[PDB]
Amino acid sequence: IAILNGGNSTVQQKMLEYLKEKKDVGFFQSLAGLMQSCSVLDLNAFERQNKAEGLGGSGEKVLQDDEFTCDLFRFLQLLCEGHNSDFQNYLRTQTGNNTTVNIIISTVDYLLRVQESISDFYWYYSGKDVIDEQGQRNF
Amino acid sequence: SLYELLAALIRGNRKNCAQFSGSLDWLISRLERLEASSGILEVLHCVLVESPEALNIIKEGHIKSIISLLDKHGRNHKVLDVLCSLCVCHGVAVRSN
């Protein structure tokens, strides 16, 4: 992200042609492989540590270190800034190699997992209605 | 040249040297043909650098053969580093041998 932090374009030119000449289906394969689970705020692990600290460091619950994931989708956003309409097409269809991985489909399936992860977290929470930090920080 | 072909097919995979349990003493028995042994020797050297499993296969009766291989041929340093590779595996060394 540090190279692309200004929404750079010459480097955006560089990654596309490097993906064209030395065509690497393993890269997008390793993207969705990274992207596969990658985080879920999963309230089952939330319940136990409340009971654990209720009757006995901490903080390792939250989507299993989701700070990595905030960097990954930042890297995906900074890979298509400036509306690189070739490259925005390229992340969809990827017509270089023999096989292809549509990451644009997969990134819908990330937040769909996240939306299901956050909605029931309210639905567990919808009756207690007074907020501690552990609700606030994990939100 | 046949041994030269087979010497190629071991240096790539860790599988193929691991697929050479029973051929080992078979090759050491064929080693006493004593006319084409250098082709057999590059074969048996290359398997020994790529499988730590194959080191535990070879026992003393094969070793005394290889020592007497130095007798029949005299002074061949290709034989000599085979014993050095028989000493140390990829990282480790066996105290028994």
Binding site: E47, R48, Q49, K51, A52, L55, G56 | R75, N76, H77, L80, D81, L83, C84, C87, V88, G91, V92, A93, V94, R95, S96
Partner: protein
């Protein structure tokens, strides 16, 4: 030998023999090292060192042979303990000057650095009596030769001769520096020679010369050890400062923090509970506010002093060698910048040292030496009837006086990972049970040590043989936090092993492991309880009918089902309104008792009037938690009557 410089067949064949001598005596074959010196007789190697007409192949072999005959056994031994930095609290350690107003040639060096034990290479009937460490030679004569070698070779090699001994400059410099490298590590070259040898290198020139490729790679390893000795001096600097600081801070706060406690009344409103807390948290509370008393002038002075010369030129000389001399050898450039990162980040190396070290007292320095030797024994033994030394090593660890006193130290040594590596190294077996018996002893000594063993259960269960499974259940026995930290998917692998017992006996161990997985305190958890019994619908495994069939009919099946009831007896919902006034915790009360219509008088009466106290006492907890005062009277005298009759039947 000097004739061989054109006898290239006999040159090369003797070279590969010289490989083979250096081959077989590797990683400390100390009996074979005593065998080889009869053929080599190291005063021959002294003549092999000095002769400036030996070929370069014979030179590099002979210098390498001199190391791994005599030195590499100790050299790798002190190479292992170069990441421990433990120290005693004695007065000479207390009275180090700690600072310049800088030299890497530190005089004191009061760390542990284990012993120098050699043995004579005699040929008398002490065969399995000396047998253990190393041959020896007058190494003090040798270090005189090296300075005689190096100072001559620098001032002669300065003019860039076309001679030098192996023809090239590579055979000239590399075996000397490598010999100097290992000899520096072994606690030789006291500071009269360090100041002499740095006059050959630093003066503050040898590194300023033009050099070939692998020689600076040797120098790269040489520079790192000076930086390493810079590090251990700083830890030895910080520990004596920790002596009087704690001696102040224990008297200053804790007595005067108690002074307002005596002058208060006895209530604990705010001021008592703020530092009366957990001990490490009390130290975290006491030290946490110093970076925002009368003592904090001592801290802020010293952090400026343990800010931190060599750091100038080392940060220069990597930039030189990259600039004019574009490099091959990816080993070298990897070796280069890790110095350069460590030079511009000296604190980050000091980060990764402080959770590795400790300070002990002078009485405990005895029991550490053999312990560090036996820990050094195992790490040497890691590279391989081979394990006969290991069990005597492991039993020596179990019978150490100062082993129980500091359970953090074995965690600080990381030795549990070392022993667990052997378990991976063994299992692709009599040393199995000698290993795990240490481990089940190892988790049980303290609390956060048991936390350290917790992080391996995903691997640990996979090798259930009959014990390895003893370790996993021992790592969860009491800590309810570690009970809650355990998750579901490994228990799928647990009950998969139970489905394999549809042929049995060996399900007796998984159920005891699950008995430690749900109860753990004197009162069960419910999160581990619900998930396993929902799996035990999916798998089935007359029950009370065939229970009496084992009473007459190899005594394992009556013990086998005796745990299965005890598993269910632990995973009751509760015995309260925790059980009663709740939701769906009573739903498991149905699905449990639905599979068991009662019939339990087989377990109650038929054994108890004669294998007795195991099955029926486990049957007690099932009726007690899962299951009116007619039954408070119905089952009576069934068990109490033989307890009354056979009481004096001893």
């Amino acid at each position: 030998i000097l004739e061989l410089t054109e006898q290239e067949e006999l040159l090369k064949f003797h070279y590969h023999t010289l490989r083979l001598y250096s081959a077989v005596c590797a990683l400390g074959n100390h009996r074979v090292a005593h065998a080889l010196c009869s053929h080599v007789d190291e005063p021959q190697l002294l003549y092999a060192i000095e002769n400036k007409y030996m070929p370069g192949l014979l030179r590099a072999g002979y210098y390498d042979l001199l190391i791994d005959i005599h030195l590499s056994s100790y050299a790798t031994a002190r190479l292992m303990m170069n990441n421990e930095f433990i120290v005693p609290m004695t007065e000479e350690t207390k009275s180090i000057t700690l600072f310049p107003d800088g030299l890497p040639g530190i005089g004191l060096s009061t760390s542990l650095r284990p012993r120098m034990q050699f043995s004579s290479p005699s040929f008398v009937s002490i065969n399995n009596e000396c047998y253990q460490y190393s041959p020896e030679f007058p190494l003090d004569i040798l270090k005189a030769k090296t300075i005689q070698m190096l100072t001559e070779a620098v001032q002669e090699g300065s003019l860039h001769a076309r001679d030098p001994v192996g023809g090239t400059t590579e055979f000239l410099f590399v075996p000397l520096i490598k010999l100097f490298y290992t000899l520096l590590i072994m606690g030789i070259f006291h500071n009269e020679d360090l100041k002499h040898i740095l006059q050959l290198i630093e003066p503050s020139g040898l590194l300023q010369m033009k050099l070939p490729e692998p020689v600076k790679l040797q120098m790269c390893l040489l520079l790192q050890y000076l930086c390493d000795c810079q590090v251990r001096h700083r830890i030895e600097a910080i520990v004596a400062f920790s002596d009087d600081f704690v001696a102040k801070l224990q008297d200053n706060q804790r007595f005067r923090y108690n002074e307002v406690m005596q002058a208060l009344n006895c209530p604990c409103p705010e001021e008592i509970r703020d530092q009366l807390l957990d001990f490490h948290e009390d130290l975290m509370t006491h030290c946490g506010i110093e970076l925002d008393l009368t003592i904090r002038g001592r801290l802020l002075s010293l952090v400026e002093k343990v800010t931190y010369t060599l750091q100038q030129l080392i940060s220069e000389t990597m930039v030189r060698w990259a600039q004019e001399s574009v490099i091959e050898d990816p080993e070298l450039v990897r070796a280069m910048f890790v110095l350069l990162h460590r030079q511009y980040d000296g604190i980050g190396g000091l980060v990764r040292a402080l959770p590795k070290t400790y300070t002990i007292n002078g009485v405990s320095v005895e029991d550490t030496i053999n312990l560090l030797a036996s820990l050094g024994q195992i790490r040497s033994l890691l590279s391989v009837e081979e394990e006969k030394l290991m069990i005597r090593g492991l039993g020596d660890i179990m019978n150490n006086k100062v082993f129980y006193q500091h359970p953090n130290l074995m965690r600080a040594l990381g030795m549990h990972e070392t022993v667990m590596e052997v378990m991976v190294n063994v299992l692709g077996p009599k040393m199995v049970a000698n290993c795990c018996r240490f481990l089940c002893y190892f988790c049980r000594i303290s609390r956060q040590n048991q936390k350290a063993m917790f992080d391996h259960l995903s691997y640990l269960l996979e090798n259930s043989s009959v014990t390895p499974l003893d370790v996993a259940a021992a790592s969860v026995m009491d800590n309810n936090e570690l009970a809650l930290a355990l998750r579901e998917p490994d228990l799928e692998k647990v009950v998969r092993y139970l489905a394999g017992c549809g042929l049995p006996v060996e399900g007796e161990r998984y159920l005891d492991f699950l008995r430690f997985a749900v109860f753990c305190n004197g009162e069960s958890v419910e999160e581990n309880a619900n998930v396993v019994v929902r799996l035990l619908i999916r798998r089935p495994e007359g029950l009370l009918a065939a229970m009496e069939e084992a009473i007459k009919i190899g005594n394992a099946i009556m013990t086998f089902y005796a745990a299965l009831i005890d598993l269910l007896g632990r995973c009751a919902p509760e015995m309260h309104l925790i059980h009663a006034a709740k939701g769906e915790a009573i739903r498991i009360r149905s699905i449990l008792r639905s599979l068991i219509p009662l019939g339990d008088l087989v377990g109650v009466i038929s054994i108890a009037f004669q294998f007795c106290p195991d099955h029926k006492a486990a049957m007690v907890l099932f009726l007690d938690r899962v299951y009116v005062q007619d039954f408070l009277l119905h089952l009576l005298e069934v068990g109490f009557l033989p307890d009354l009759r056979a009481a004096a039947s001893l």
